[PDB]
Amino acid sequence: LIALLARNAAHALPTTLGALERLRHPRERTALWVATDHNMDNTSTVLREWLVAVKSLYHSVEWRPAEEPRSYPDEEGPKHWSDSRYEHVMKLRQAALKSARDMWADYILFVDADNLILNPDTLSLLIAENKTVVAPMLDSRAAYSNFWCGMTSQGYYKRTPAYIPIRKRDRRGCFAVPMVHSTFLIDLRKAASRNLAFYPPHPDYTWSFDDIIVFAFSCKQAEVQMYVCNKEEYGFLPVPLRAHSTLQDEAESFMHVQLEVMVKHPPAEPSRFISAPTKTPDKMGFDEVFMINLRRRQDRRERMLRALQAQEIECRLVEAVDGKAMNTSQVEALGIQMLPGYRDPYHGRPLTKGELGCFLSHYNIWKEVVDRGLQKSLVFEDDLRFEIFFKRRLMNLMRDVEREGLDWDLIYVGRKRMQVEHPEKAVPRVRNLVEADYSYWTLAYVISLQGARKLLAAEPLSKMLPVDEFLPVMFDKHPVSEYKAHFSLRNLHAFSVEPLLIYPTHYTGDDGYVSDTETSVVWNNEHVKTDWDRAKSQKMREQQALSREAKNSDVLQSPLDSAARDEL
Amino acid sequence: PVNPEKLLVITVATAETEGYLRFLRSAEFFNYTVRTLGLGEEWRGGDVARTVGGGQKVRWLKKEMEKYADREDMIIMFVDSYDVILAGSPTELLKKFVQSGSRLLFSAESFCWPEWGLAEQYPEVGTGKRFLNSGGFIGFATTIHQIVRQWKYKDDDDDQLFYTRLYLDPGLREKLSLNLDHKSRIFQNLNGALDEVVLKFDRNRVRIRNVAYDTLPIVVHGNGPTKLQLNYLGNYVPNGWTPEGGCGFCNQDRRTLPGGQPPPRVFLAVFVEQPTPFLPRFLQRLLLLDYPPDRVTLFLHNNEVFHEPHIADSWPQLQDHFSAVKLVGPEEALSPGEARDMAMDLCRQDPECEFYFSLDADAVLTNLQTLRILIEENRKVIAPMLSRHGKLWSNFWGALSPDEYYARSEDYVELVQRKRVGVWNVPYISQAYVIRGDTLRMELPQRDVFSGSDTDPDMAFCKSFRDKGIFLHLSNQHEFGRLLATSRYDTEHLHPDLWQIFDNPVDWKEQYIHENYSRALEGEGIVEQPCPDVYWFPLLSEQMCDELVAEMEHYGQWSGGRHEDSRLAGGYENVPTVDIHMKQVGYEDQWLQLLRTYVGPMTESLFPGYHTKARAVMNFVVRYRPDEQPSLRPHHDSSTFTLNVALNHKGLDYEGGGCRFLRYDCVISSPRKGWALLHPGRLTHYHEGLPTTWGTRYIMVSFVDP
Amino acid sequence: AYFPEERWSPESPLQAPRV
Numbered sequence A: 001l002i003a004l005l006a007r008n009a010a011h012a013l014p015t016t017l018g019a020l021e022r023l024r025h026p027r028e029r030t031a032l033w034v035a036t037d038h039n040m041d042n043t044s045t046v047l048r049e050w051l052v053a054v055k056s057l058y059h060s061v062e063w064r065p066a067e068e069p070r071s072y073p074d075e076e077g078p079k080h081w082s083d084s085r086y087e088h089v090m091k092l093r094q095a096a097l098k099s100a101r102d103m104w105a106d107y108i109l110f111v112d113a114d115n116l117i118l119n120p121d122t123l124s125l126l127i128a129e130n131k132t133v134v135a136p137m138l139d140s141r142a143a144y145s146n147f148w149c150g151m152t153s154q155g156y157y158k159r160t161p162a163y164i165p166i167r168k169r170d171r172r173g174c175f176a177v178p179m180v181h182s183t184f185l186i187d188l189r190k191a192a193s194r195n196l197a198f199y200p201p202h203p204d205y206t207w208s209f210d211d212i213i214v215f216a217f218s219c220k221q222a223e224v225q226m227y228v229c230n231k232e233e234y235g236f237l238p239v240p241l242r243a244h245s246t247l248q249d250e251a252e253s254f255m256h257v258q259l260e261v262m263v264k265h266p267p268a269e270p271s272r273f274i275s276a277p278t279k280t281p282d283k284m285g286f287d288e289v290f291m292i293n294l295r296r297r298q299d300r301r302e303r304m305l306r307a308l309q310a311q312e313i314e315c316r317l318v319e320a321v322d323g324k325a326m327n328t329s330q331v332e333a334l335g336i337q338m339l340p341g342y343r344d345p346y347h348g349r350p351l352t353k354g355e356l357g358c359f360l361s362h363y364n365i366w367k368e369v370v371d372r373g374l375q376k377s378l379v380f381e382d383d384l385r386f387e388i389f390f391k392r393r394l395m396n397l398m399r400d401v402e403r404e405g406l407d408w409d410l411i412y413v414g415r416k417r418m419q420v421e422h423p424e425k426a427v428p429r430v431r432n433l434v435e436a437d438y439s440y441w442t443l444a445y446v447i448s449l450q451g452a453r454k455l456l457a458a459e460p461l462s463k464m465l466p467v468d469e470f471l472p473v474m475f476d477k478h479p480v481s482e483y484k485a486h487f488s489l490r491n492l493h494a495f496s497v498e499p500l501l502i503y504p505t506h507y508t509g510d511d512g513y514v515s516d517t518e519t520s521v522v523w524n525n526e527h528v529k530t531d532w533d534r535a536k537s538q539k540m541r542e543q544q545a546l547s548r549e550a551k552n553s554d555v556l557q558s559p560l561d562s563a564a565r566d567e568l
Numbered sequence B: 001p002v003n004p005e006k007l008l009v010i011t012v013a014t015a016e017t018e019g020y021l022r023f024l025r026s027a028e029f030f031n032y033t034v035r036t037l038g039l040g041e042e043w044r045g046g047d048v049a050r051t052v053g054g055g056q057k058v059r060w061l062k063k064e065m066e067k068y069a070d071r072e073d074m075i076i077m078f079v080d081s082y083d084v085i086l087a088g089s090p091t092e093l094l095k096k097f098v099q100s101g102s103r104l105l106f107s108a109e110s111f112c113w114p115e116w117g118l119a120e121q122y123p124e125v126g127t128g129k130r131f132l133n134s135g136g137f138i139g140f141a142t143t144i145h146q147i148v149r150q151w152k153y154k155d156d157d158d159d160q161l162f163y164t165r166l167y168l169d170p171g172l173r174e175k176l177s178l179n180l181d182h183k184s185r186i187f188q189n190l191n192g193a194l195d196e197v198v199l200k201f202d203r204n205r206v207r208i209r210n211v212a213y214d215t216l217p218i219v220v221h222g223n224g225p226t227k228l229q230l231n232y233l234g235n236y237v238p239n240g241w242t243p244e245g246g247c248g249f250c251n252q253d254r255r256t257l258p259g260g261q262p263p264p265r266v267f268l269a270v271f272v273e274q275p276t277p278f279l280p281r282f283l284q285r286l287l288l289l290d291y292p293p294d295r296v297t298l299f300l301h302n303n304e305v306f307h308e309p310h311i312a313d314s315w316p317q318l319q320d321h322f323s324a325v326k327l328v329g330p331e332e333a334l335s336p337g338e339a340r341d342m343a344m345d346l347c348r349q350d351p352e353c354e355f356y357f358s359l360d361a362d363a364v365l366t367n368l369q370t371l372r373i374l375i376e377e378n379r380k381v382i383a384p385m386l387s388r389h390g391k392l393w394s395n396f397w398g399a400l401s402p403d404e405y406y407a408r409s410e411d412y413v414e415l416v417q418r419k420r421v422g423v424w425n426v427p428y429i430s431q432a433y434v435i436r437g438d439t440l441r442m443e444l445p446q447r448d449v450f451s452g453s454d455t456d457p458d459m460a461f462c463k464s465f466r467d468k469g470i471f472l473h474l475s476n477q478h479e480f481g482r483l484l485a486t487s488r489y490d491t492e493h494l495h496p497d498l499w500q501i502f503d504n505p506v507d508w509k510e511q512y513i514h515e516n517y518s519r520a521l522e523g524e525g526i527v528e529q530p531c532p533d534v535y536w537f538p539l540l541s542e543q544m545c546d547e548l549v550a551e552m553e554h555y556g557q558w559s560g561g562r563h564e565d566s567r568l569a570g571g572y573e574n575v576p577t578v579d580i581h582m583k584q585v586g587y588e589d590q591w592l593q594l595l596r597t598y599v600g601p602m603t604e605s606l607f608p609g610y611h612t613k614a615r616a617v618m619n620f621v622v623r624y625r626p627d628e629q630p631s632l633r634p635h636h637d638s639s640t641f642t643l644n645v646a647l648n649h650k651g652l653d654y655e656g657g658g659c660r661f662l663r664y665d666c667v668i669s670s671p672r673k674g675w676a677l678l679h680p681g682r683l684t685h686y687h688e689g690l691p692t693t694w695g696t697r698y699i700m701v702s703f704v705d706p
Numbered sequence C: 001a002y003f004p005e006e007r008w009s010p011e012s013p014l015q016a017p018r019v
C-alpha cells in the first residue's frame, strides 16, 4: 500500500508519478492512500487526473483532498515547519498507519512527494531482507541523505565515524542506524510491528517535538532496530531548502536533481497518464549562447541540448573544425603556425591536431563575436556539470558586474586552480568576484566585446598553442616568461569567481573519460598519435589538491548557494 | 590450526587491586593460561604514567624468558594487568595472528608520548595509526628473546622510548619482521580513539566494535587518562550483564554472616545539615534497624541550632539503646569537612570498627535490611541506589565531564528506573556508603580527604579515592529508599512541616494522613453510613489535628460572630460563627491540594457516576464553647456537599453532641477525632448542630463544589 | 555519553493468518 503525503508538489509530480508506476510488482496486488493538504499550488488537479487515469490497475484507492486552506495560520512562510505543521504531519502519518492496519495489508511504503524512486527494483529488492523497518539509501548531490548515523544528545545529527564511509558505498550490506527518514517500509507482517505509534507520542519521550524523531523513540522503545541497506543504487532526493525560501527554489532544486540523474543515467521519462508543463526558453540576459560541438559525438550534444531545455535557456549552437581529420593542405592555407619553441609542458609533444582544431574554433567564435558587435557572450563545451540555481546566480552576477562598472573582459566561470597559493585579491565592491590567476580547463568563459577586440589585435595566427595556455599568458599571469616575451600585449583584464558554476562531467582517468580534445594526432606528420595519458594524467581534478589553507573567505557571497539541514 | 595449549599469558602486578581481579575474571572466563610476574615485589619504578617509568617490567621479563630462551614452538603475549580486559576467545586471537603473518605485532597509538622528534622517522601508514606503543606485543619466544636481550639500563628508565629506538632501525625491522597493527585488529587503545567504539550486544556475551574500521578486537588497553572509560566498559564486556541471564559477577562472593558470632562492629554516622524536614521521624527510625544495638556506635554531628530541641527530645532513647553515643553541637563551629574528617579519623584510629557506614541526613531507608545486604556484599566500597520521587535525580553519576563535573551517560536513565539490575562501576557516590575498614587502614592513611581544597567535600573525597585505584560499586537489586528534597524549607512557623505537602508527598501522606484511609478507599468496610446519604470515613491522624489546633491557637485571633462580614463579598453572612478562615493563615492552597488529592477519589467511589474537580471557596475551622457561641440554628449549605472533620476528642476535652438532621430524625452523638462526614447540603438534608455542655471542641469545615 | 550501545533484539515471530 504505497501511500503518500504531499503539499504543493506539482513542480516534480509528473516524473515521480511515472517512477512510481515503473515499479515491477503485481498491479493487482497494490494500492494507494494518497492525500493532499495545505497545497497552494494546482497539485490537487494533477494528482486527481493521474488517480482517475490509473484507477483500474490498483486493487483499491482512496483520497481525502484538503486543498482548503492553502496555508497554516501561524506560519512564517511556505518553508516554515511549525508546531501545528508537525502535529498535522504526525496525525496524517498515524492515520495512514491505522488505515494500513485495517485492510490486512502487509508492508507499507510511505514515500513522500519530494523523494523519487528512480530504480525499478525498489519494492522488489527492499522486501527481500525480511526486516522490521528497512529503508532505502536515497543518494543526492551532496552528503545529506535519508540515513543518519547517530543521535548525540537530543536527536541532533552526530557525525559518526562511518557516515562518510557509508554514503560513499565503501561497504555494502545492511547496517543498523538510529534514524531513517523519507523512504521507510514499515512491514506490518511481523508481530512486534503492532506497537509502532506516530501521532500519540510515547509517555517516556523527553526529546524535542519534531516529527522525524517521534518515530525513532517508538522504534527503539519497542526493540525494532531499523536496519538500512545500500547494496544497490535506489534513486535521488532533493536537499532541503532554507526556512525563508520560496517554491521556485524548490522547483529549481528538483530540476537540478533531474539533471544530475541525467548526468550518468538515461533521462527519467515522466508519466503518460498526466501531462507535462513545458516552460519557455530565454537567453538568461546574455546576447549569445555559444556551444562548441563535435560532429562525431552526438550523445553529449543531445544531453547538452536537453540540459539547456531543462534550464529554460536557448542556445546558439555552433560547430568546430575537426582538427584530427584536417590535413596540412588546409591547415597551411589559414596561416596557422605553431609557436616558436613550444611543446607540451607536461609530456613534451609539440602540439596536437585536436588542439589546433579547438584553437581554430575559438578564433572563429571570437571573430564572429567581434563582427556581430556582441557586447557579451557565453561559450561552453560538450560536457559540463551545472550548479543548482545556476541561471539566477549567473544573471545576478552579470547584472551586478554591469551595474557597478568595471573592465571585466575575461571573468572566469570554470577553471582548474593550478596556482596552489594563498587567496587571490578581491576587486572592490564585487560580490563573489576576484582577480584571476593561472588556471587550466577553461571550458567556460564570459568574455566582452573589448576582450574579443584585444584578442583579435593580439592576432596569434603565427603562434599556435593550447587555449588554456594562451589565456593565462594574455592575462599577464603565465609562469614561464618566454611565452610572454614571445607575446606582445598583455592588456587583457581577467577575473574569477569563487563559486564556480561548472565542473567537468567526467574527470581524467574515470569512467567515460574519452579525451578527444587531448588524444589527437600531432600537428606535423600522421604517425604520432599519443593515446590517453594513463600515468601522466596531470589534469585529473583541481579539488583534492586545493583542500588546504586556500582561504578565499573575504569574497562576498551571494544570497544564493545555501541549502542542506541538520545532516550536512 | 594452532593449538590453544601453546599460548601463555604473562602479566605483572606488584600488589593485588580490584583491576587485577577484574582481569583475572576476564581471563578465566575464556579459560586462558595466565602467568603472573612480580607478585609482591616492591615497585622499583615510580610514577606509573605521570612522566616516565616501567623499567622494572623489562628487567623482570628479561629474567623471565631465560627458561624459554630456545622454545620456538609456543607463542607468548605480554600485556598490562591493571587497565586491560580481554574480550575474545584464544582461537580468534591465534587465527588473527596467523593471518597477519608477522613475527611481532605492537599496539598502535595516536601520538608520540616519550619524544616528539622521531615522529618523521616512522614509516607511512595509509589510514591506521603510525607510531608504536609498548602497551602490549605478540610474538615468538625466540623473537622476543632476541629483541629484548639487549636491555641494560636502570630500573627507573622508561620503556616506550627504548622500544621506539629499537623498532626505528630499518635493518633489524626487516630482519625481525616488526609490524604494527595499524587497523586495530587485535589491540585497541582507547586513548585518543574514544569516539570510534560502540558496544555490540549479543545473547549471552558482549563485545566492542570499531565503527571506523568495522572490526572486533580481542585486547583493549585503555591507557592514558582513560581509566574512567575502561572502568565503565568493564560493566558489560564480556560477562557483566547480558539480556539473557541477568547480570554476571553479582551474587557470588558473599559473607552471609556465618558462625553465629556477634556481627562485625559498625560505626554508624549522621551529618544533619541544611535543615531537613521530617527530622524527628528519621531519628525515631534510627532505632528500628535490623542490627544488634551493642555493635552499633553512633556519631551524630548536628550543624543547626534549629534542630537542637528535636535532638534533645530524641537523646535519652538513643543513649539507652546503642552501646556508644556521642554528639557535636552547633556551638563547636565545625565545618562539614572537619566533621567527616574527624569521624574518619575516629574510626580509622580504632582497630575495633571494621565498617564505617556513613548516612547523610536526607536518605530514608524504607527497607530495614540495607545494612545486612550491604555487609553481605563485601565490596571494597558500595552504596545503595536511591532516587528522588518522580524524577531522575539519583545519588550517583554515570560519567565525568573534563571539568570533573556531572556529565550524562547512556545507561543512567536505565539505571535510575531499574531496567537493569546488578552492581555497577560508578565514578561518584554520595549520601550513603559502606567502606571496608582495611581500605581505611592501609589504603587511606592520610587524613585530609574531604578538606584541603576549594572543591566540595564529597567530590573531593571521590577524586582522592579514584586516583588511588579503588572501585566504587553501586547496587540496585532491591528497593532501598528515596532521597528527600531540601531545595527550599522555611522555618518561620511552629510546625513548618505542614507546608511540605507539595515538596515531598509520600512522606507527608505517611505522617499526617490517617493510617486507615487507604484501606477505606480500596473498599473493605470501615466506611459507616449511620443515616442515608451520610457517610463516615477516616481521613486525618492525630498528629495533623493537634498540630492544626496548635497553629490556630498560635494565631489566636478568633474573628467572626457578628451577623455582618468584611471577608464575604456580599457582606451579609447567613449565620455567623466564631471561625478562623484559611485565607488569612496562608494555608488555603495546601488545604485545596489536600481536598483535590485525598478527598476526590473517595467521593467518586462513594457516589458512583460523579466526577469532581474539587473546587472550594469557603473553608474554615470553628470552635464551640458554652459561653462564646452555641450550636447553629437549622440552616442549609451553599454547596453540593460538605466536609465535617473533628479536631479534638469528645469527653477527654469537651462534652456535647454532633449534628441533627430534621428530615430523617437522625442524631450524631459521638464525633470521632480523626474522621470525616460526607452529606449533601443543598436541598434534602436539613441539619442542625447539637449544643455543647462542658469543655471546648474544634471542628474543621469545608464547602466543596458550591 | 561515551561508547553508545547497539541494543540488539531478534526478529519477532510472524503474525497469524487472517480468516
Ligand SMILES: O=c1ccn([C@@H]2O[C@H](COP(=O)(O)OP(=O)(O)O)[C@@H](O)[C@H]2O)c(=O)[nH]1
Pocket: B012, B013, B014, B015, B043, B048, B049, B079, B080, B081, B082, B083, B135, B223, B224
Ligand atoms: O603500584 C603499581 C605498580 C605497578 N603497576 C604496573 O604498571 C603497569 C602499567 O600501568 P598502566 O597500565 O596504568 O600504564 P599506562 O599505559 O597508563 O602508562 C600496570 O600494568 C601494572 O602492572 C601499577 O599500575 N601500579
Ligand SMILES: *[C@@H]1O[C@H](CO)[C@@H](O)[C@H](O)[C@H]1NC(C)=O
Pocket: B515, B516
Ligand atoms: C486502623 O484500623 C484497624 C482495624 O483493625 C484498627 O485496629 C486500628 O486501631 C486503626 N488505626 C487507627 C484508628 O489509628
Ligand SMILES: O=C(O)CCC(=O)C(=O)O
Pocket: B631, B632, B633, B637, B658, B659, B687, B688, B689, B690, B701
Ligand atoms: O454543627 C453545627 O452547628 C452545624 C455546622 C454546620 O453544618 C455548618 O457549620 O455549616
Ligand SMILES: [Fe+2]
Pocket: B636, B637, B642, B681
Ligand atoms: Fe453545613
Ligand SMILES: [Mn+2]
Pocket: B080, B083, B221, B222, B223, B224
Ligand atoms: Mn596502561
